[PDB]
Structure 1
Amino acid sequence: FRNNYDGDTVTFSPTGRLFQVEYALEAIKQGSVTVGLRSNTHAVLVALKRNADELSSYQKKIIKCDEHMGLSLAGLAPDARVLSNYLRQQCNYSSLVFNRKLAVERAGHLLCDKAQKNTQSYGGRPYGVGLLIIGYDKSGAHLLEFQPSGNVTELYGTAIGARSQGAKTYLERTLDTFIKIDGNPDELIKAGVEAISQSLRDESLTVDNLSIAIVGKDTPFTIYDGEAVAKYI
């Protein structure tokens, strides 16, 4: 039973979900929560940095991948690393060769294929990681949700990591306000810190180890760390 659709990448179900996809979806939640919201001129990521040991020191877990691109993770960190590795390489090859700056949709599609080849051999594997990728290109602002299941939707707002549903319900409500507010950073950032505080219900909110990352028309890729998140709590 278990052993039919677990480790076996070649099998199918009448439903089309294997055990390996449902575990992967659970793995995303076991990382820390990170929320996404965007207008049409900016895209924001608000992410909580909460240490997992007593002595551990805070380190960036939003990683700038290019001038016009980055991602934040939620889920498994090795799994996240390999993909980020391939994407930085991919970014370079497009820029040298075709001068092409990627839109999110294009990268995404690439990302699905990569996972797909590794779910067609027993010696490769599926992943365990979701990613929210922001970027600003000439089609405006973008926020994308990447899933190991290969479901890619470009959204106005989302959340992944634990306790997504706090933030989603707030994000669908303040939707209409935020999307029509263009050229103004500060309101969208502030609103992201409020969203993420509804994801938390019993877990701390840190006033110097929150990290907010933004991209846009008037903003090249900046992560605000330490002090500089203060005036948006």
Structure 2
Amino acid sequence: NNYDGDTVTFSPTGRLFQVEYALEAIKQGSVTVGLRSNTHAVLVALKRNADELSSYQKKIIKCDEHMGLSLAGLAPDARVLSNYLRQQCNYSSLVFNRKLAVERAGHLLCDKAQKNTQSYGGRPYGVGLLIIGYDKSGAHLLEFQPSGNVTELYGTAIGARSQGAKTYLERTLDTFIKIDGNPDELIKAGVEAISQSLRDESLTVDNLSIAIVGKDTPFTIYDGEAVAKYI
């Protein structure tokens, strides 16, 4: 109200309204789902178009051979944060000959987002990210909020109507975690999860975007007729 003019101002109840408004931009964004087993991790994203003449905005970004994310909210902010991740993954490789741990990548994103919430002049990031990866401790899935909060999960979803997919994953928890050594069945579970967040529209060939990473699988993105198999 009087305490939402900038990010440097607490409300009387201890709330940061600019951060909460940035969180709101994620809810307006298109749905994206994340889930993993012990061998693989999968991203599934519903892409959004401007109209019938327009393309479908890309949702998934690669960060390294073993890591990448999906976005929901301001796409340019996802480009800035993904570019930062690319550099940090790359710094780890060039200096230490070491693939960057997914957990440490989350800690770096948290700290970068936090600086924008405590300083005058700047603004919080207006995007939520789902990071998947495979490192020395196996498969991982992270949820990033621009408040700075990063959370390691078995599965999750962000964007508009994401609550439907999240409930499904909460039921399916014991099933999909056990899908080891079977990439196609893990993607199926992700496609079935994101389907719980659809209304009016359905999953078409240029609508759906899927990514996967695993034990002997580099981070690869599937679009176009490559996802027709899963429709």
Q: Which TM class, normalised by the smaller chain length?
A: over 0.9
Report the equivalent of 1:180. Answer: 178
Distance 1:59 1:32, change over 3 A: closer
- Residues 45 and 213, structure 1, Cα contact 8 Å, conserved in 2: yes
Instruction: Quote the offset at 1:210 in angstroms.
Output: 0.9
Residue-by-residue CA offset, 1:15-35 (whole Å, 9 max, x unaligned) = 432111221221102111100
SS of equivalent to 2:28: coil
Give 3-state SS (helix, strand or coil) of 1:35's partner.
Answer: strand
Q: Are 1:167 and 2:165 matched, yes or no? A: yes
CA positional deviation for 1:202: 2.3
| Deviation (angstroms), 1:37 | 0.9
| Residue 46 of structure 1: how far off its partner (Å) | 0.6
1:214, 1:221 within 8 Å by CA — same for their partners in 2?
A: yes
Distance 1:92 1:69 in 2: 11
CA–CA separation in structure 1 for the residues paired with 2:87 and 2:2 = 36
Residues 62-71 or 104-113, more deviating: 104-113
**Does the Cα contact within 8 Å between 1:7 and 1:122 map onto a contact in 2?**
no
Moved more, 181-190 or 7-16: 7-16
TM-fit CA distance, 1:116: 2.2
TM-score by length of 1: 0.92
Partners of 2:61 and 2:68 within 8 A in 1: yes
Distance of aligned partners of 1:93 and 1:181 in 2 relative to their CA distance in 1, 3 Å threshold: same
- After superposition, the Cα gap between the structure-2 partners of 1:139 and 1:14, relative to the gap in structure 1 and judged at 3 Å, is farther
SS of the residue corresponding to residue 217 of structure 2 reads: coil
How many Å apart are 1:48 and its aligned residue? 1.4
Task: Determine helix, strand or coil for the equivalent of 1:208.
Answer: coil
Contact preservation (8 Å) 2:56, 2:206: no
Distance 2:170 2:203 in 1: 22
- Report the alpha carbon displacement of residue 107 of structure 1 after superposing the two structures with TM: 1.5
**Offset, 1:93:** 1.3
Q: Is the 8 A contact 2:19 2:117 kept in 1?
A: no
CA deviation vs aligned residue, 1:54-92 (integer Å, no higher than 9, x gap): 311235331111101111100111211211121111121
TM superposition outliers: structure 1 runs of 4+ over 4 Å: none
Q: Distance in 1 between the 2:169 and 2:117 partners?
A: 34
Inter-partner Cα distance in structure 2 for 1:104 and 1:15: 34
Q: CA deviation at 1:126?
A: 1.0
Once residues 30 and 92 of structure 1 are traced to their aligned partners in structure 2, the CA distance between those partners, rounded to angstroms, is 32
Give distance in 1, aligned partners of 2:13 and 2:201. 36
Greater shift after overlay, 154-163 or 173-182?
A: 173-182
Please tell me whether the aligned partners of residues 73 and 130 of structure 1 are also in contact (alpha carbons under 8 angstroms): yes
- Give the RMSD, CA atoms, in angstroms: 1.7
Alpha-carbon distance in 2 for matches of 1:122, 1:182 = 47
What is the CA–CA distance in structure 2 between the aligned matches of 1:66 and 1:154, rounded to whole Å? 19
- Cα deviation for residue 40 of structure 1 reads 1.3
Relative to 1, partners in 2 of residues 1:142 and 1:119: Cα closer, same or farther, differing over 3 Å? same
* Structure 2 counterpart SS, 1:134: strand
Secondary structure in 1 matching 2:109: helix
The DSSP-based 3-state class of the residue aligned with 1:8 is: coil
Q: How does 1:4-43 map to 2 (within 5 A)?
A: 4-13=2-11, 15-43=13-41
1:149-207 Cα deviation digits (max 9, x unpaired): 11111101110011011101111111101112211111111111111111012233213
Contact residue 143 and residue 157 of structure 1 kept, 8 A: yes
With over 3 angstroms needed to count, the CA separation of the structure-2 counterparts of 1:203 and 1:116, relative to structure 1, is same
- Alignment of structure 1 residues 24-173 onto 2, 5 Å: 24-58=22-56, 60-173=58-171
Runs (5+) with no aligned partner, structure 2: none
The answer to whether the Cα contact below 8 Å between 1:136 and 1:217 also exists between their aligned partners in 2 is yes
Worse-matched range after superposition: 40-49 or 94-103: 94-103
